[PDB]
Amino acid sequence: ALNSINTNSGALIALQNLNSTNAELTQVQQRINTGKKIGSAKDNGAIWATAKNQ
């Protein structure tokens, strides 16, 4: 509703945006820790496989 006490749709959207920021922060921490932008097959499978074979 517009003046609801049971549902806070604005808080749900704010939670989604905070989760997006936290996921970006986790990615940057992995890059700082490994020194790699592609550190596993999850980052980019084709380039990861090429680098492994090379």
Binding flag, residue 5, a copy of itself (CB under 8 A): yes
Cα–Cα distance measured from residue 41 to residue 21, given in angstroms and rounded to the nearest whole number: 23
Residue 28 backbone phi and psi in degrees, to 5: -65, -35
What three-state secondary structure class fits 19? Answer: helix
Q: Min. distance of Cβ 5 from a copy of itself in angstroms? A: 4
Asked whether position 10 contacts a copy of itself by CB under 8 A, the answer is no
Among the residue ranges 1-9, 18-26, 43-51, the one whose residues contact a copy of itself (CB under 8 A) = 1-9
**Taking the CA atoms of the chain, what radius of gyration do you get in angstroms?**
19
Subset of 18-37 contacting a copy of itself (CB under 8 A): 35-36
